[PDB]
């Protein structure tokens, strides 16, 4: 279990999404390793605490840092991914990603259902 293995399973827990890109996962890890995960213990430790039990305000602060990176797709004011950012995926049924058309006529006059 390299840093990537642990990162990627943490991310599957924290985000709840199965099939997150490892091509993007590697990029978010490397970007985050500028400012976070300075120890080689912090990630395995966060995986443990996040599993059964509770987190320190500093462990929950790191969880958030990881979620934040997958949802917004930005680390340290640098776009890692635009199109594959998870927040877009959460409202894909109703909202588009600005600068990408829906393949439909758009049709925005309808009230979204759910």
């Amino acid at each position: 279990t390299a840093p990537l293995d642990t990162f990627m399973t943490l991310s599957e827990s924290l985000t709840g999404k199965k099939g997150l890109s490892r091509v993007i996962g590697e990029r978010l890890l490397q970007a985050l390793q500028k400012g976070s995960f300075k120890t080689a213990d912090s990630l395995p430790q966060l995986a443990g605490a996040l599993a059964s039990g509770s987190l320190t305000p500093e462990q929950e602060s790191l969880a958030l840092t990881i979620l934040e990176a997958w949802y917004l797709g930005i680390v340290d004011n640098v776009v890692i991914t635009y199109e594959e950012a998870l927040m877009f995926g959460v409202v894909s049924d109703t909202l588009v990603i600005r600068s990408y058309c829906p393949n439909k006529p758009g049709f925005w006059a309808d009230k979204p259902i759910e």
Partner: peptide
């Protein structure tokens, strides 16, 4: 579109939520 703004806002509350509350609150606010 307010997804970016409303998702950023949620992460500033510095509260970890289960993926399902997070996604709910993103859709509600945006």
């Amino acid at each position: 579109s307010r997804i970016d703004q409303e998702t950023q806002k949620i992460f500033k509350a510095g509260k970890l939520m289960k993926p399902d509350e997070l996604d709910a609150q993103i859709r509600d606010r945006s």
